[PDB]
Amino acid sequence: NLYFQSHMNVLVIGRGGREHAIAWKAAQSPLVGKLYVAPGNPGIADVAELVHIDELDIEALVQFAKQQAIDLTIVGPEAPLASGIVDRFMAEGLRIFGPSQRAALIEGSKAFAKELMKKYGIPTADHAAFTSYEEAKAYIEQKGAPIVIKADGKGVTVAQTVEEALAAAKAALVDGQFGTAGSQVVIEEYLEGEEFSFMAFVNGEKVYPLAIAQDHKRAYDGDEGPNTGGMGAYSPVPQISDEMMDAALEAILRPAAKALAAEGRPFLGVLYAGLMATANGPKVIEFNARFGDPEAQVVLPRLKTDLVEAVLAVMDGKELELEWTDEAVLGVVLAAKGYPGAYERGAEIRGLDRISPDALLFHAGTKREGGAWYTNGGRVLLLAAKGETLAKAKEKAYEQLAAIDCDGLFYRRDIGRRAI
Numbered sequence: 326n327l328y329f330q331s332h333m334n335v336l337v338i339g340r341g342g343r344e345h346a347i348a349w350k351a352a353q354s355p356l357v358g359k360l361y362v363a364p365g366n367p368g369i370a371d372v373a374e375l376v377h378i379d380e381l382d383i384e385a386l387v388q389f390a391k392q393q394a395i396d397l398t399i400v401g402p403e404a405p406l407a408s409g410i411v412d413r414f415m416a417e418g419l420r421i422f423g424p425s426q427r428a429a430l431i432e433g434s435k436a437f438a439k440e441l442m443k444k445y446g447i448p449t450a451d452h453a454a455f456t457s458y459e460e461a462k463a464y465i466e467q468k469g470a471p472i473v474i475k476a477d478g479k480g481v482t483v484a485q486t487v488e489e490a491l492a493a494a495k496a497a498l499v500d501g502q503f504g505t506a507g508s509q510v511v512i513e514e515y516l517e518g519e520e521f522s523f524m525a526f527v528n529g530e531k532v533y534p535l536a537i538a539q540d541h542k543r544a545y546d547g548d549e550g551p552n553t554g555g556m557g558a559y560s561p562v563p564q565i566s567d568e569m570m571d572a573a574l575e576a577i578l579r580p581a582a583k584a585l586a587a588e589g590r591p592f593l594g595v596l597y598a599g600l601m602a603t604a605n606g607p608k609v610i611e612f613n614a615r616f617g618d619p620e621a622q623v624v625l626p627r628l629k630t631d632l633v634e635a636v637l638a639v640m641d642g643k644e645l646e647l648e649w650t651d652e653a654v655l656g657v658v659l660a661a662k663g664y665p666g667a668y669e670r671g672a673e674i675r676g677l678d679r680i681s682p683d684a685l686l687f688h689a690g691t692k693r694e695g696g697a698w699y700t701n702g703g704r705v706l707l708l709a710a711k712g713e714t715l716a717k718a719k720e721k722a723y724e725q726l727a728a729i730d731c732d733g734l735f736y737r738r739d740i741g742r743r744a745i
């Protein structure tokens with residue numbers, strides 16, 4: 326219904342699966358003439374031209390963007406946002422979809438986020454930091470247990486009793502790292518319920534919600550092992566009621582966007598809320614200032630609305646209702662053995678040519694050499710599949726995953742298990 330100039334030159338900043346998903350979606354826009362990804366990866370080269378410039382080499386990206394007359398730049402990773410890529414681009418008159426350094430702090434500093442949510446009455450887990458044991462003790466005795474104790478320098482304890490919490494807190498301050506302000510201990514309210522990711526396009530106070538998704542951050546099946554950037558995800562999320570979703574939109578997302586704007590930090594881009602559906606309603610775990618990975622890989626394929634058109638509409642503050650397919654999407658991450666810890670690179674990946682054309686294969690950390698594929702990163706690939714139902718999406722995804730053979734990769738087999 327909306328009109329925007331065609332034959333656009335578009336630049337996507339990043340190198341992972343999230344960027345491959347963004348590029349893939351952008352390439353299908355009738356408004357795009359030329360698509361570039363910096364620095365991208367071998368898999369992304371199949372849908373866009375790679376630009377050999379680091380995401381943090383801001384001065385070069387600015388020059389490149391002006392040189393190639395880029396009409397729109399989309400930032401994937403948070404690093405360049407935290408570095409002020411948006412600020413520099415805007416000063417050069419370059420259109421870019423992403424938050425300013427000041428607004429991106431919502432993700433950069435968990436303390437800032439907690440500070441903001443407390444001031445504006447946004448539901449979230451209680452949070453407090455201490456350098457004094459006596460002060461930590463008094464606080465712990467007020468909140469009770471179970472409670473979370475976090476030491477700096479492994480260091481996270483979910484204390485089941487107040488006594489254990491005190492022992493852990495004392496240990497954190499005694500054995501924790503000695504910073505320039507001494508040792509410190511972080512205490513947080515332990516929340517229970519179903520976790521879900523709620524992303525939305527934002528521009529000032531205007532919020533445009535995206536479909537919600539559920540990511541499994543634990544490294545191993547049965548949600549065991551250390552936390553990761555995400556080992557799998559799916560959308561929609563049946564177990565999250567529409568009421569929980571709406572409460573999240575009206576009591577969390579809209580208020581956060583208004584809070585940032587009220588604080589002189591208007592946000593533009595994708596505001597990603599990591600939430601917990603508790604019995605008392607939705608509560609924020611953390612905020613991210615851009616597309617989540619692997620959330621983007623399973624949510625963007627469900628978006629029927631043209632992505633580029635949507636982004637431009639948001640940037641112009643125009644009205645827009647996003648449309649989504651009824652079909653579900655589930656994705657599974659293939660990671661290098663050892664990840665999220667130390668992992669090896671260089672294992673050959675066979676079978677990428679055996680996967681169905683309907684399967685969505687997003688490259689993270691792959692490398693092409695001598696006509697073959699090799700692992701080259703923590704998270705290497707993500708394979709997603711569409712399905713009439715979540716169960717169908719899950720079956721198709723895992724069915725296709727078996728076609729891949731690599732002794733240097735592993736992947737959870739329980740993605741979507743509980744949901745179904």
Ligand SMILES: Nc1ncnc2c1ncn2[C@@H]1O[C@H](COP(=O)(O)O)[C@@H](O)[C@H]1O
Nearest residue numbers: 450473513514515516517520542552610
């Ligand atoms: N206050 C909390 N209550 C329950 N779980 C939490 C809390 N904070 C963090 N987590 C878990 O830790 C994971 C990663 O958050 P983080 O360790 O801060 O990077 C989340 O996906 C949650 O499952």
